[PDB]
Each structure stands twice: as structure tokens, then as C-alpha cells.
Amino acid sequence: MDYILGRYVKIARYGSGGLVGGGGKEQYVENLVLWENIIKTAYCFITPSSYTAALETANIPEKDFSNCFRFLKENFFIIPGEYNNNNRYSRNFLHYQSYGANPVLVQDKLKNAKVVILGCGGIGNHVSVILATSGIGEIILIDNDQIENTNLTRQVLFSEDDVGKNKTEVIKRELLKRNSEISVSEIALNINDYTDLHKVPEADIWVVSADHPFNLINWVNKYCVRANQPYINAGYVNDIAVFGPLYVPGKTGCYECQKEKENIDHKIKLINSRFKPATFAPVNNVAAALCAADVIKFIGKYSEPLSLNKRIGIWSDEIKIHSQNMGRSPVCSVCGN
Amino acid sequence: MDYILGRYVKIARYGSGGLVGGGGKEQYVENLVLWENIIKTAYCFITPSSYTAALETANIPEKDFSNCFRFLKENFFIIPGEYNNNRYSRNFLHYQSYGANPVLVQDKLKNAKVVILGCGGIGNHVSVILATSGIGEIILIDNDQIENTNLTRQVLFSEDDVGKNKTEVIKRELLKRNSEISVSEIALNINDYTDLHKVPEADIWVVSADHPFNLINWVNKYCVRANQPYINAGYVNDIAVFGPLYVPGKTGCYECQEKENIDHKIKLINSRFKPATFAPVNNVAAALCAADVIKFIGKYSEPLSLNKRIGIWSDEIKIHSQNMGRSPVCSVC
């Protein structure tokens, strides 16, 4: 029944009292008397100790030490001594610990996971490297396209030489070169109609990032609603990084839920058919990173993925993030009544 | 004087009228008729045409047309045909969407020298983005060897690289992706305020390193005594962070805005600190840091972190910036 202060907690005299912990969990306590007692209690836990073995070394009243202990424990500033077991994924461990999770356990869930990356352009490139190096067991690369030179902007795993080769091929080569303890596989396919979706295997989650055709997302959705298959969308609209929704069968809203005359209508169609995204690495990467963060959480099960029932957008030309509601609707034409 | 519609514009029927543009420029138009008129004039520029011409082309009232033209030109949905000319091709629509001549922006970048003071997580990511975007010369600064525990964030390193010098590998991997760029390495680690002098002069310094702790305070004060621009980037566990971007005589910096018993425990506990790394957070901070460098050097748009330290949460939907503009009462400026 040992507890130990996590190495990720930093304290700091601030304002009247002080700060405890860093990041999203940072707590500000105004009462100097209390803040100081928390510091004294935490100090007693630097070495794996039990509640009592720690109180004995404390020079404060058992009542206070107790309130300080409760503080530290709920915010996960102190965690079970067992959660501290040189590994290649050692870095990620502190992260999981900070969320009250068991590193080992989490890592275990990732290893037994199978993830599918649909469309290996800019998004699937970054998502796959994050997932691969984080410990995802199997990755299925689904893309029947070829590397060009103009692709060397957001596709971080490619070198010019690779030009002419298959994306799915180069990614695997590059993924294994970074983590040989996982398995990668390719599927020469390109979702053209709705029928092609049957060609994609079953898996913990599907990362859908390719943007073609216009209503590709809509078929992946439709299909996945009936296939009870979890999936997450990612991409961008020019300068806006976008990720989500993260669809989960029976516990979340689907893409369609919360959803031009004669000559003008043809003009609309011609201008759009003429559309080509204004790609930009920074935007592509923000979208990929946050998408991957959500896939690791959804699978690791230690914190709530952000894009559950939401389509999130992060701007690049202004400090702004905004999410569109996509919660379950009983009145849905895809998975409703 | 020819004008051409951008490929990055999109349109759709929505609510009462429609949407024109995608991304931050996306504007909703109420008047269904004004919408329809906007697409009608935009239609005359799928293929390049001058003002006068399009006018004698589209059958819309010279009044309504003029309005639609200016609208499209001001939002940059329509640009000078000359701006529509390559390796950095996919980046041209981005600069075009901000009303800049991609070739000129692509040129400012080619003539820039960027220094990456820290080749770990942020360094790796910032470094590959600048290189593949065209930053002409990049100075990689550091004195550490690749480890196994690093393959988690340093997207450039492989298992077969473990042990080698970071700058050595980052440099190889960069030239491998953009063979027309000039990279270089300097085996150095800032251990004291006197180490900074050993760091070259450049358009901007990407301060990624986070050791010692008070390295950013050191750099702030030094960069002011060298009139050197720098942008800090990193993370506070699960919160990505980038900025401020310091620009001599234009913005502010990291300086503007005794009970011995406890202070002991405090120091002892803080010395055991270890950051709670997470690649997603790392990547976001680096992506945005790089977007700011590319903008600062390309002048086509305002960097987001000018006078500001931005934070992007990861366990919560939230972005927040701590303003810190110029200030007189400072220990550096």
C-alpha cells in the first residue's frame, strides 16, 4: 500500500500561496499555511511509503497531513508505488501516471491493439509514426497511391529517393525502422465508391484522413454505423486543422446526425471540382497530433478523448479553437429510430 | 492586369445563402442573391481574365459586379494571375491564400538562416518542417547522443541511429528530404549564460531546449543584447506551448509581464522534476512554432505568438495566451 510523489509534479511559490503540479492539473492554493503543509506531506512521499510510514516522518498534525494526502492523491500528484516500473516507452509512462493510470496496463492495451490508417497522405503519415512509436501493435496502411515530389512537404517519412514508390510501402519501411517490435501491413486500395469499404479489415479503430472524393467521410460513416466499427476523422480546411468526430458504436453521435437552381448550380459544381486544399505542414501536423492523442486515449482508456461527439477546429492565423456539436440524435437518418 | 480565382476557394449552399471560401477566410452570406452573384463573377476567373473582360463576360449589373470583385479580391479568393506559376508547389496555395506572391515568399525563405537551439522533440519537428518548406540554411546546435527512449518524439531518429550524435542524424535526414538546403551542426549545450555567445547570428533562434530550467531567462536577456529574434517553444506536461516571438524594438519579452524550512523541501522536490512527455503535445507545439518562424521570415502573415505565450491544452478543449507586450520597468529592456 505504498505511494510515491510523481516526478512530474513541480511546486512554486505564487501570489499569496503557491502552485502544485504543472500542466492541465495545476492547482493554485491561496492559503500559505495549507500550501506549505502540502509541500511537507509530498516531501514525505518522495520514497515509496505507506500512509502511516509517511506520517511518522511528517512534523505536522495527523488531521492536516491527511487533508494534504487527499489533495495529492486525487490530483494524482502521488500514485501507487507499483505504477513505477528502462523501457523504450518509459517516457510516456509519466504521462499516463499523471492521469491516475497504470503505465504497464495502458502500455499493454496499446500492444494488443490493431489500428487502421485509411489514406496515407499527410495526416496518416504523422498519425502512424506517433502510434507506431507509442506502442500500437498492428497498423494497417490502406492507400494505393504513389509518392510524388510535391508530397515532401507534410509527409515527414519520405525522402526524395522514395519518389515513385508506394506510400504504404515506404511508411512501413520507415515505421519498422523506428520500431521493429510492432507489425505493419499494407492494403493496395482506394475508396472510390461505398462498396470498397468492405475491403477494409476490422480493428480497434479506423483513422480516416484521405480527402477524396468530396463525400468520402459520409460513406465511412454510413458503413461504420452498421459495421459497429469505431473510427475517427482528421484533416483540414485550408488553414484550419480539424480532428474528430471520434465515432463509437452505441455511445456516440455519427457524422450525419447534426446535418442552386439551373445555371448557377453548374457554376457551383465547376468551382468546387476545381478545389485543391491549401496544404501547410503546421496545419497538417496539428491535426495529426491531436488525432493520434485521441486514438491513444480511446485505446489506452485513461482519459477521455477530446473528439467524442465533436468536430474540433484549431485555427492557424488566429488564436482560436472551436468545436461543432455532433452528439447522438434520435432523429438520425443513418443510425436513428 | 490579369486576375485568376484561387484553387483553395470552395462554395456551398448553407442556411439562407451560402459559404464562400474555406478556413479562416470562410464567410457566410445571408442574401441568397448576393451569394449567387459572388459565384457568378468568381466563375469568370476560373481561367485568368482582366476586370474589364469578365465584366463584358458575366451578365450581372456593373454595380453588383464591382462589389463582388472587390469582395473576392480583398479576401484573396481572386489573385493576380502572375501569382499562379515545382518542389514547394503545395505551399504556394497557402501563401496565395494570404495575398502574397508565392515566388517572393519562397525567396525570402531561401535566403534565411535559422538556428535550432535544441534538437530534441521540438527541434526535430521544427527542423524538418523548415527544411521541407525551403528555409535555406539551418544551424543545428546540441551536444547529446540519440537514445532508445527518444524514438517516441524525435520523428527523424530510428533504432539504427541509437548512440550516434543527434545533430549528425538530424542533418543527414534533412538533406535527405530537401537536397537543396544547407544544414550545419555545432556540438554545444547551453550550460551557462556565457554559452550563448557561442551561438551564431541568424534571422531567428528557435529556443527548444529546456535544460537548465532558467535557460529561457538567459536567452531573453542575451538576445536583447544582440538584437536577435527568437521564439521559445516547448510544453508544461500536457500543455503545448510556443511563443513569445521576440522581435527587437517591436515586442516585449520574457521579463515584461524567507522561511528556510519550506524552501528547502521546495528546491529538493523541484530538482527531481521530470517532464511528462507526450508526442501529440510535442508535435503541436513544434508545428505552431514552425508556422510562426515561416511567417516571421515570409512576411505574408502575422505570427500568432508576437508578444504572446500560447498554451494549447490536450486533456481539455482550450487555447489561451498570456499577453506580455512591451514594458518599461524591466531587468532586460
Binding site: 484522413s209 467521410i217 484533416g235 468536430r311 | 470552395k10 456551398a12 459559404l19
Partner: peptide, 5 residues
């Protein structure tokens, strides 16, 4: 933010 990803 009102179109494809």
C-alpha cells in the same frame, strides 16, 4: 470549418 477535413 463547415466542410471536408
Amino acid at each position: 470549418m463547415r466542410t471536408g477535413n
